[PDB]
Amino acid sequence: PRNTREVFAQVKQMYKTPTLKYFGGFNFSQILPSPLKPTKRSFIEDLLFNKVTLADAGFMKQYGE
16 A cells, blocks of 8 residues: 555644744734624523423422312
8 A cells, every 4th residue: 555645644743833923823814703692502502401301290280279
């Protein structure tokens, strides 16, 4: 085989040296807003509600009598 094409594994490094010594990298679009909050992805939490879904409803049922 030939693991010469695997060299890309090193290229990924791209010399991690993102520092602002002389100029750096500041743009006008860098100081812009960017709100976000993907809570939908955390739907698994709903699984906990399954335990006590109508549990609270049982309280109002007591009023029936």
